[PDB]
Amino acid sequence: MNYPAEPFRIKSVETVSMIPRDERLKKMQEAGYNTFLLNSKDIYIDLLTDSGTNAMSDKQWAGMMMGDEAYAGSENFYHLERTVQELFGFKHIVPTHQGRGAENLLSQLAIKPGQYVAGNMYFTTTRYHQEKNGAVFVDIVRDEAHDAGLNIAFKGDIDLKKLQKLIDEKGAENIAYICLAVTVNLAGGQPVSMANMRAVRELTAAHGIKVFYDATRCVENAYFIKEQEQGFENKSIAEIVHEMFSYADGCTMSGKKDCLVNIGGFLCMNDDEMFSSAKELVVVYEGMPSYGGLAGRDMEAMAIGLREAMQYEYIEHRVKQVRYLGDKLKAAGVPIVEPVGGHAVFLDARRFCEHLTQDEFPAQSLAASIYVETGVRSAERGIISAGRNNVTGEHHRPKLETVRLTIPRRVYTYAHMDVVADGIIKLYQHKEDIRGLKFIYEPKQLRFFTARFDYI
Amino acid sequence: MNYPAEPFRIKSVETVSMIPRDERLKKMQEAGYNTFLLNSKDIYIDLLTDSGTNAMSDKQWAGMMMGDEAYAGSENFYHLERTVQELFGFKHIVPTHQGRGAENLLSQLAIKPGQYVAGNMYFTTTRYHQEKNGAVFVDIVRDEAHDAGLNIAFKGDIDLKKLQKLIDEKGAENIAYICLAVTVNLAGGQPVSMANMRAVRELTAAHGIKVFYDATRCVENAYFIKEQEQGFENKSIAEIVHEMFSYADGCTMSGKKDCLVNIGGFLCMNDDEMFSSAKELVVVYEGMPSYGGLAGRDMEAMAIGLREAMQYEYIEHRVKQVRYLGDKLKAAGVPIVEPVGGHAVFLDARRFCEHLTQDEFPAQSLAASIYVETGVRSAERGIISAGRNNVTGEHHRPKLETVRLTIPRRVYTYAHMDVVADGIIKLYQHKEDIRGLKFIYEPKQLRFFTARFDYI
């Protein structure tokens, strides 16, 4: 089916208030037209992020009643360890409270100042931890990933020529590791093919270079391989996931994404010495090697959720629900990043509001308009989030000026997607009426989080 | 909007699954062709009943952690008592484990042998408890309620002329009480108007006759009043519910329906002497006046759920989701009871299976065939449910021979409704293949729950 029915039914609901437009207008004004400042209690459909916002199952909630809260050696850790060893195939696992805790550990362990880390684009926290430990980041994604309207498969793949070039100019010993993300968030949630993972593994192995995956959306990635990569159409999601990680030396994982939980993460590796070093550091920042900054019940929920994520029908519906939203927007002529990724639809606010300049913050204003008209919260991912250059005093000015519609797993229905699409499309039909915004309060940094605006 | 989105988010899920047709065939035969004897694990979408199958909210589950399990005087009872007094306006409440526990109490307290109980169409458990305590049941619903295809508003209303005739012929002193159900389950979930409730109060009061409501689906009923009865368009659900019960002397309630719970019921009354007598009897069959055969946590969940049911957007969506299923079926030519009711779509098995007579149990057989071909469980609501005449020994022969696609509250989506509709539409194309059934095992009362059949 183009759009399958949910492969689950509802066990329990999160109630919502359903406040009307006049009241949403006041809330948006009180939030200074910044959706990051809205109160959760005032939001009907919250698409700010797919991170930690997922609905758990009955089996996960049963596990939440079985937390072994011991400081060391919790049975829940051994359940998580066994599950990750089975499904990802790595020899060793260290729990962390979420993904950036694992990134902190990996970058401290595997980078020397001056070295390079090359990846298929970057994620904000991952690159910060690389750079804070002295690495220079090099983007080795295929050029195609940067073209928003290019509707091609496996747009997240690494350009092997860029990787060969880096090796030739800088030298293998000066490359700390390759950071291969699945899927690639900044490209719109675009997958990487098994062929590319295998090819990257072959080239790096010939030079002794390590490859660590950013595995946060690896199950969405596996679905794209099953659906679209020749030869994988009849492999199980689990078989695909296991093969993907066979081409890596380790990974960082945010369980808050594809492990179907509200908190949790981990670091995996095959190397024994790196495992020992990682355990010496986890106690500094997170907790013991057997809890990593998580309650026992959360290790249990993450173990159960990662296994639930292997169900084909679950991940097919997850990805096709996102696709449903993107397809409805595209059919109405709304410009989006293509093809639709695994976890989100991205609106091109620059083209949505061509009557405004980027200095008038069209993505921020479009996000405000979306909430007023529908009760849906979306994330600004444009000039505001890019920040300001404190040296020159001017904005960093991003290539992509977007509004991100990020879909939590198992929370919403197709009818909710219709609410989102209908409101965005109605606005698009009168896009000229969307007003530009100006700062009335701007902090020196983290400005997306607390900045306040008014209409021009 | 014809079909609004869910006015809630999913908080937790439960997986669904389908087994092959050949296995479904074997299971239906093992169940003696009675869907009530099928196992839950073998059902894909379970529409047997809206009773006790509802999804609770986060607030209800929080209450489930606050059970005061004391044998007497639980705080959860006082919460339930205060909530029901506020929302229904009755002086006194006695909890019961579900609705038929309240019916047992009412029928023992209020019936002397030989008296008449008059109601707007029978219900199975209700009529049995009336008859077993010596009453003769008299149907005083309007004739239109028995005409499946007649689309008129408030089909559940009592015909005041039938009520007056009963009074004239039998004498008011020989009427135990009037049983006024809202909505009327077996007419198709058909509502009763506020005008009719007021008229019934006025007429019975003039003779000193008591009126006890069956409140099991009273919130669905209040929605129809708000949607369709002149002068109520702007009144709140809670205001409508409170006025409804101001025309009654008490009620029986299965909380398992409109109180959004999985277990629970209660008996309400205004009269002090009847309350004292009800308390003397609740301890025989159920438990204390302050637990009534329920865990404390379940009184808490029922208190919270009844209040949640008062939210307009919740009940509007509940009813319109059922309407969506019926609309799709009717447009494809599948015969149904009209208008669609509050809790279920009722297939008209007489028209679906015109090649069978009612003595060949077309609704029972249709329910079986639906399961074999689709994995969807539905309920017989026809000659089998109607039972035997307790005087003549022949079958009761209701004009309505129907199969009920019964929708649990807050469990399924519109996509699930589409799956159900598509499968029934396909069965309809070969309706002539549905075979007649005959009894092989017939219980002595309430036979539909466990009877077994074989094909003719």
Place this chain on the structure above:
Amino acid sequence: MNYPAEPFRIKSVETVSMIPRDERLKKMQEAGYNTFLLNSKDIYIDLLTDSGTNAMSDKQWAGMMMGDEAYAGSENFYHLERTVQELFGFKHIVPTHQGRGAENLLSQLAIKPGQYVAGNMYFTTTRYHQEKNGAVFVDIVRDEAHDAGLNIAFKGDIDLKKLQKLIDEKGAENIAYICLAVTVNLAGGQPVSMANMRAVRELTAAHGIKVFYDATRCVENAYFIKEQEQGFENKSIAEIVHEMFSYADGCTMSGKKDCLVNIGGFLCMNDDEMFSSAKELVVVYEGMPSYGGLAGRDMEAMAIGLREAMQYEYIEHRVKQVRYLGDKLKAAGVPIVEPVGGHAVFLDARRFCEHLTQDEFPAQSLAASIYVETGVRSAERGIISAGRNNVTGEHHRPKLETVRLTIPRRVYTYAHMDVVADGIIKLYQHKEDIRGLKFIYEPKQLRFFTARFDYI
């Protein structure tokens, strides 16, 4: 050990509080001097009953998250059925919402008017359901069970000479069944020996008489057999339980006692025809044969809890905690029933209040005074609970006039027992101050639950 430490630790708590004596004095008067009418919030330590007040385990709470709420054929029902078949050995099980629901079914199914039901001491609800269906109750417990100060083992045993005499004088065909309770609640929680169960099985089987066990405290009973009956010292609790029920034709069970739950019960039987008849009747009063007036989650919790109860260390501690309280009271000279039983310490109110006659309700008044002086709630188990003779209308006058300090399972500690003992010992020092009581409101049956009194 005499008093082992708890074989569990605390997973979660509920706060308790003492209120001032002047407030307890007013509350006791407002409750008509009946502890059953006090509110839970006003009780410091609530020893009214061990029924439904137990603390569940983490594993049971995990099961509570796995409720299959289907109206028919829930997986939780099948888990309960498999568990009871394995542990008790009966062919068939019908769930009920609690014990008296099972008693209603058994008494309606198995009693013809005028027949005799013989049991090892009456119980309140049990006797009412026997008499309501037309039986004469005959006490066949050994005479010793009625003597509070007689410290002998297996005081609950049936006197075979009394059973033989009933058979000889009345005829076996006029005996509906034998009710064999394990333990015997109102004798003080006194166990029945395996030898006695065997002897009763042999005599009844020879005459075609059925024996239905009251299984409500069967695990406590098994502990006494393991501890004290020659030849069972090395048998497991589970082995003992399974052998006990091999001597029975079925059982009634309030799961609210030894199944470690807050709600639940069942009726078991080996006879297929009685099973069919019981299923035809359960739908009238309780629910389907596959839910019986319980939520699916509650069938799950009861299945888990009954298995947990088989753990030796759990039941040893359970019984020895009760013994600790009784030993401390006896050592201070407070008169109690001996030996101490499995679930409660029974104060001998005839001796505690020697200055009152039984017609002045000394047990009822002692329970009131305990609450006033200590904040501890306890239960009358004497003339009030015994009820009125259903032939003469005079009080039944049990030799045992007692107040029951009933201990919920896994709820309280030895320190709480010390508080209870200390308070009762202090009251004993001025026992002459306890005033006699008289009825001001008397229910027509089961009067102890809600009767109100005033001081003479």
Place this chain on the structure above:
Amino acid sequence: MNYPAEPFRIKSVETVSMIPRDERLKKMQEAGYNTFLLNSKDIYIDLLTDSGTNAMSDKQWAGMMMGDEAYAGSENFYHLERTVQELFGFKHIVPTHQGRGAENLLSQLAIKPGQYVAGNMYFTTTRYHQEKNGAVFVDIVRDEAHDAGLNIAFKGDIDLKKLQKLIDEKGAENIAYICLAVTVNLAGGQPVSMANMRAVRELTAAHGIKVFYDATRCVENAYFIKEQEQGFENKSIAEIVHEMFSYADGCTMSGKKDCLVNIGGFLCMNDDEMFSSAKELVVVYEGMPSYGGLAGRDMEAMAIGLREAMQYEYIEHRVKQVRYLGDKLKAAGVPIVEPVGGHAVFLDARRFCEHLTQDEFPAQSLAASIYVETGVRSAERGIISAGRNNVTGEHHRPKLETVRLTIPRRVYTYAHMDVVADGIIKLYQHKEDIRGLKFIYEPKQLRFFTARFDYI
């Protein structure tokens, strides 16, 4: 009363079990003679730590069902913020996943390399984060705190003469801050007086020096003030807590101790600029300022638990239960730190094992022997925990060489305390059998968590 009963009842339980001594010996060897490396399932009574091992209440578990998992603006964050502002009085709060996450933030924000941080005794994670960010730690606790057997009140107080000397010798501008811990963990859980907090505030304020409290066991501290500091006898715990923090510029908190939770912490500060800088840094390591590496449900549970901790009867019982264990050990001749602290009994391994030198790690070996002989897990708090001197490379050599019997809140009973005491008393009778240890694996920091040893 010396030893009050628990001011709560048990709501739910978790089983406990013991493996036999021969198996414990093998497990201890496999764990390299480090109790931190034992598995939870192999422990009978787990007194490794009071961190994150607490039993939550029914009200907290209700909150766990009300998690608002939104990435920003969660109701649970606002509840936590409001609660901490009310109870502690600080202007701003940043959540962290646990205490060392807050320490990471404070140390990075408030320390210029080379500056001094002065505290009332070191703590392991705290000192590591101070030193990693370039500070020199200076102990300014009163000398008596290092004297295990000296029973004096408020042993945790700062010696103002030592603080004045640091100011005079080093200059106020070279002191990053004072770290004032309540209670002082490694001194034995010893409290700080309000008078001392006031005097420290006055002296630091006169020199412009900031004071940040370690609030982890502040409620235990407040109890000691109420019980023993003149003038506080009739002040509530909450009033005491609020006054305590009025003398601070901010705090770090591990909620896993006195906030009665299994995960969670926070950083508070009054300074607006530090708050802005902390929000910029929390995103790097923990998460948004709106969740700080915690699920919404955990912010909710922490807010509820901190408020519950203010109940006098709860904290009185908490501290007196620890005192019960210490009193029993002391009376039997077992050497302990005196007076007993708020959260643990500290055995004095220097006196327990006088046949060993500190260089043979007597505390580490005593903890191993305790587990082997009793199944009780305890923590080394001596030379191993003290770590290496980061200037000389030699062991730090604390005067206090102790083993900590750390009591989780609301988990164990006095009967469990008796078991612990009896086993340690028995081991003391053959104390000469405890063998010295040597490192076989030493982590580079926080070595006590994962080091491995062998017998000399």
